[PDB]
Each structure stands twice: as C-alpha cells, then as structure tokens.
Design a protein around this ligand. Structure first.
Ligand SMILES: Nc1ncnc2c1ncn2[C@@H]1O[C@H](C[C@@H](N)CC[C@H](N)C(=O)O)[C@@H](O)[C@H]1O
Ligand SMILES: [Zn+2]
Ligand SMILES: [Zn+2]
Lengths: 297, 113
C-alpha cells in the first residue's frame, strides 16, 4: 500500500472507462478509523488532504483569487474546512463561504441559508462544496440521482465558474447527481478523490480541473457513479494519516495566472489549450458582490 | 449605561470550575513558525498550536458584539498561536493575555522586550 503516504487516492482512469451497473457500496475497511494527530478534527484532516491533492493539479491561481465554499458550517458552529482553505490559499484570496445553518467563520464573508438563495454578481476561480444531507443514505430504496443543492451546484458551475476554474464537490454512495458527473466532462480533467483519513467512507470529492465551458467528453452520470462505486468496492483503501505530518509544502503556489475578459466568440483553440493547462482564467475583475435571498412572511 | 461583560462572565465561569469552550479549530502546521501571537497563516513554533482565529474569539463564539466601537474582530480571518500548555482553553487564553505591539509575541509567552 504505497498509497498510504499520499494524501488520498484518485479514481484510476481505467475505472472511468467502464460501463458498470450500480451496486450497493460495501467497503472492506468500513468502520476502521485512521488515528488522527492529537487534537486534530476529522474535517481539518480531510480538507488538508483534499488541498494536498489539489496541490498536484494544474489549478489556475491568479492574483486576487476568488474561492467560494458551500456547506462550510458544522454541527459545532465553526468552519474547520474554511480555516484549512484560508491556510492553503494565498494571502489576499477572497474567500466566501455559506451554509444552511449559522456558524462562525474565518471567511471574508459568510451567507447563511439554503444554497439556492445565494447569488453572486461575479464568477469564481475555485468552488468547494461539502454540502451533505444525511437523510439521503437510505438503504431500503433505490439509489437514484439526487436533486436538491446538487441542482443549484450544477447551475452555479455553468453560470458563475470562470473558464479555467476548478471545483471539488463532495459526494457519497447516496449523495450524488448524474448531471454533476456529466459536467465533469466540461473540464480539461476530472476525477473522484478519496482522502486517506476518510477511506472507510464512500465519500469522495468530484474534482473538475480547468473549466472549458463546453463538453469535451460525453459522460453518462449514472454509469459513471456506478463505475465509482465499483472502484471503491474492489479497491480497499488503507486508512492513513501520514500525509498530515508534513505541511512544509502545503500552501498553494501563487502562480499569478493571467485573467482575461473574453466573449465566447473569442475562445479559440489556443485559448482553450491555455485553459486546459491551468495558464489562463477568463472572467471579469470587477468588485465581488454577493447576496442571500430572504423570503418574507 | 448597561452593557453585558462577557469577558468577566467567562473568567468567573472558569474560576467556578467550568468546562472551557471547546471545538476551537486546531490547524496542522510545521511547528517551526515565528511563534507570533496572531498571524495571517499558522505560525506555531515547537511550543505552540495554531488555531483558526474566529473559533477562539469569545465574541464570535457566543454571538455577541465585539467590545469596541468598531465591532472589529482581530482574530477572525487570522490564526492565533496558543502555548501548548494552555491549548485546552484557547478562548480563555486569548481573552486573558495581550500581544506586544512591537514584536508581536504574547506578553509573558514569548515576548522578550
Ligand atoms: N441545501 C443546502 N444548502 C446549504 N447547505 C446545505 C444544504 N444541505 C446541506 N447543507 C449543509 O451541509 C453541511 C454538511 C456538513 N457535514 C459539512 C461539514 C463542514 N464542512 C465542516 O468543515 O465540518 C451542513 O452544515 C449543512 O448545513
Ligand atoms: Zn471575534
Ligand atoms: Zn515584545
């Protein structure tokens, strides 16, 4: 298990290319738990390993980077993942987080309420979502593609993610959406990443790297989720906290990636290739304005 | 004239043998940092833990106004270094101690001025 020294395990390409049928997820290491460093919360370690893995991708990192983090609140009233994101992102990065329930955050701004009520004027360089509804894990009904916040997320990605931007959306066996898998085909690259501290869970982060705004690959979401479940079912991942102990190279390298304003007619193949290599972001650079719809009654 | 004194309330609660506020967000770090009190990224040294600022500010945690005219919070969005000996009560530590405005270390916990 040389994967034990990595921050996690990504879905191997060959498993992406299968055409499996959806099965129940039965993890061999179910119930096992990695031994976390003294006093470290599970979610701090999880976000840390997610960020360590993202460090290995071709993320666009412009000056004045824009990152939005959905599902940032916890049952403790704080935002561990947001703290890890702020630690990881370059100083001066605009970080906005949100959650259905109130919480205390280190983000530049926090919106409370259902994801569907959140609107932003600008586009974003990085979208993180840990939104999860535990009522989805029902083993007595068919495991079908879920709507709810997933719907929103999809829309958001297509409307408010800058070309060349990236996303990490949390899913599980039962918390998933076919259209999100399909959207993964609109990035230069994609994967499903399982952190090593949470390998005993069906949880994964659907990572889309370098948004292209159009499908470069046609992905059937139902088949792709079945493929992910098959991978997890046949590849036990050894729980490991090793990667947590070396933070010397943790910070996201500031790359000063160029930011251009462009009309869709101008996105030629040279521009698309620059997008696919993490060397270009396409969006405006006006002020960042956000709001949460309030229903009155 | 009336104002709630949450600082004194928490101090008295501690003296009364009360459970210190929990779930302050401890960060993973090298522990070879500058050791300064409040920083833009975790700066804990060999003798410190670094916590997310907001999670160790009594006013943020209890949902009350910050004790100054601006309502400004000097911990939110930053990282606070706590001596490992006191990391069981980061809120109480930040509340009871002061940062040296010249070197940036905790007075009596790293400040050699
Ligand atoms: N429709 C929704 N809109 C916004 N947030 C949601 C929605 N559904 C579920 N959530 C949130 O998703 C979160 C799931 C949490 N386990 C996230 C943990 C948190 N990220 C942490 O760092 O500990 C909850 O706090 C919910 O408030
Ligand atoms: Zn505060
Ligand atoms: Zn001093």
């Amino acid at each position: 298990s040389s994967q034990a020294w990595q921050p996690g395990v990504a879905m191997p390409n060959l498993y992406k290319m299968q055409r499996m049928l959806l099965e129940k997820c039965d993890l061999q290491n179910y119930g096992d738990s990695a031994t976390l460093p003294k006093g470290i919360m599970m979610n701090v370690a999880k976000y840390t390993q997610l960020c360590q893995y993202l460090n290995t991708l071709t993320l666009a990192v412009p000056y004045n980077m824009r990152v939005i983090h959905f599902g940032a609140g916890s049952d403790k009233g704080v935002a561990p993942g947001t703290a890890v994101l702020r630690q990881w992102l370059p100083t001066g990065t605009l970080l906005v987080d949100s959650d259905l329930n109130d919480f205390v955050s280190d983000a530049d701004s926090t919106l409370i309420g259902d994801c569907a009520t959140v609107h932003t004027a600008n586009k974003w360089d990085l979208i993180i979502s840990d939104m999860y509804d535990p009522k989805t894990k029902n083993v007595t009904k068919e495991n079908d593609s879920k709507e709810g916040f997933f719907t929103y997320i999809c829309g958001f990605i297509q409307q408010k993610l800058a070309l060349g931007g990236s996303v990490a959306i949390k899913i599980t066996e039962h918390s998933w959406n076919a259209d999100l898998y399909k959207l993964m085909g609109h990035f230069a690259w994609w994967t499903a990443f399982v952190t090593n501290v949470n390998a005993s869970s069906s949880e994964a982060f659907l990572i889309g790297c370098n948004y292209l705004g159009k499908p470069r690959e046609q992905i059937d979401g139902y088949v792709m989720h079945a493929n992910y479940i098959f991978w997890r079912n046949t590849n036990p991942i050894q729980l490991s906290s090793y990667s947590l102990f070396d933070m010397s190279k943790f910070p996201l390298k500031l790359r000063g990636t160029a930011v251009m304003s462009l009309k869709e007619g101008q996105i030629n193949d040279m521009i698309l290739s620059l997008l696919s290599k993490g060397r270009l972001i396409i969006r405006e650079n006006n002020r960042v304005v956000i709001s949460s719809d309030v229903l009155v009654n | 004239a009336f104002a709630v004194d949450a600082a004194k309330a928490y101090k008295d609660y501690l003296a009364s043998g009360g459970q210190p506020i929990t779930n302050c967000v401890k960060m993973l770090c090298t522990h070879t940092g500058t050791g300064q009190a409040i920083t833009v990224t975790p700066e804990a040294n060999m003798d410190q833990e670094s916590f997310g600022g907001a999670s160790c500010c009594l006013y943020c945690r209890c949902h009350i106004d910050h004790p100054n005219p601006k309502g400004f919070c000097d911990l939110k969005g930053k990282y606070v270094q706590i001596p490992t000996t006191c990391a069981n009560d980061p809120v109480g530590f930040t509340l009871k101690n002061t940062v040296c405005t010249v070197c940036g270390m905790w007075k009596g916990y790293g400040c050699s001025c």
